[PDB]
Design a protein around this ligand. Structure first.
Ligand SMILES: O=C(c1cc(F)cc(F)c1)N(Cc1cccnc1)Cc1cccc(Cl)c1Cl
Ligand SMILES: O=C(c1cc(F)cc(F)c1)N(Cc1cccnc1)Cc1cccc(Cl)c1Cl
Ligand SMILES: [Mg+2]
Ligand SMILES: [Mg+2]
Lengths: 218, 218
């Protein structure tokens, strides 16, 4: 049984932050890539599938309220000072409104899809919203963690489940860009396009209300 | 003299539409790529410059109120029916609000930069806004047509001024993607990064209020 019916839009989602959850981190970058279910349900001979022609994309850099750790800066190529030099603004009401306006362009139900999203992206997004007193602003959404999905799908078909490990295993080659939120979204999209009908079936069967994600902090 | 001071953000801009201006066309896709002036003023040995690490990007497909022409569909890879199949919504108030929220994340003054923007992108954007009764919604912005800029800059340094012609001339090779609004924005960004300090100087000297752009129709 499908708990919430068929998801109409999959929003591939990735954020960068100042550090890992135990550091009480803040967002430095976010990317949403909204794909209608038809792109996976009814896909139109390369090694890696091309992305769908019709997609919506939002990629934003954000000025966090604290320094990025050296480790974060090495992996993301961002620092708080450099974000500031590019005039980036903090995570504020306008940003929350922009996110909601972007989601409102997508048919519902919406499902956020993020790799280790239950550990990283989903609780951090909830924390940033809570700090604005906008708890529940995005609770119309559903979400799934792609690491859970891809573990289940690999088990059904037949090691590390990092994004890069899965990508290399499936496509016999490393992904293009590992250093930006957009790059991580595009790599995830490619993985999900490997067996797209199976992935979509799994998402529909296991989608969870975003409101069930507790904020990382606050 | 700088008529409006130094532009702080260059928003590389491209739209796709149902047809050329004489057909009274409607938007099918838009892409904004916001780059702080420092990326051009103070750039950090490849053939083509890499894009700046810190950018904001918005790419949206739009359901137009009429069919795309065969010619438009061949060049853009979009059709009205396919946009509809992907659940795309029309150019509406929510979209205008999303655009403004995105621009509000950028330091002012803002300058839209589009290739043949005076013929295509700028008057069409003004027309879509006018149809919503949102004339002047974006008139905080400035704009420049990159074909005018690049003609001036090539003359100062020393044929077709299509995006592809310029790109091939500068980089000795064709651009990656010619079929999406994002692809056209990224190609334009690359051209503008060829002599970035000169391009930025020209933009600052010649930026025009967006309110001086008459709507394409209506
Ligand atoms: O940017 C984040 C991040 C951290 C969060 F808590 C919440 C969030 F939304 C993103 N990273 C974690 C991560 C790891 C794997 C896949 N996706 C993200 C990257 C990262 C890696 C290694 C060391 C560091 Cl210090 C950092 Cl920041
Ligand atoms: O999509 C548009 C377009 C048309 C407009 F009026 C307003 C607008 F914002 C975009 N095209 C014009 C164009 C040409 C060169 C560079 N940039 C855009 C593409 C195009 C080419 C050839 C035949 C057709 Cl029928 C079409 Cl639609
Ligand atoms: Mg991630
Ligand atoms: Mg164009």
């Amino acid at each position: 049984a499908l708990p919430h019916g068929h998801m109409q839009t999959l929003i591939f989602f990735d954020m960068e932050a100042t550090g890992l959850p135990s550091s009480r981190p803040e967002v430095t970058e976010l990317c949403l890539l909204a794909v209608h279910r038809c792109a996976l349900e009814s896909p139109p001979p390369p090694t890696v599938p091309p992305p769908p022609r019709v997609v919506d994309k939002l990629s934003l850099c954000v000025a966090p309220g604290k320094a990025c750790s050296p480790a974060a800066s090495e992996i993301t190529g961002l620092s708080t000072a450099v974000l500031a030099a590019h005039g980036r603004q903090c995570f504020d009401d306008n940003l929350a409104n922009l996110l909601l306006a972007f989601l409102r362009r997508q048919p519902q139900p919406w499902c956020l899809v993020a790799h280790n999203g239950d550990r990283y992206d989903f609780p951090l997004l909830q924390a940033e919203l809570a700090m604005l007193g906008l708890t529940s602003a995005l609770d119309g959404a559903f979400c799934v963690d792609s690491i859970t999905a891809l573990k289940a799908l690999e088990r059904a078909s037949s090691k590390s489940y990092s994004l890069g490990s899965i990508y290399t295993r499936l496509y016999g080659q490393s992904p293009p860009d590992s250093h930006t939120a957009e790059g991580d979204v595009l790599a995830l999209l490619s993985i999900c396009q490997w067996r797209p009908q199976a992935l979509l079936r799994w998402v529909d069967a296991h989608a969870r209300p975003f409101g069930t994600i507790r904020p990382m902090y606050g």
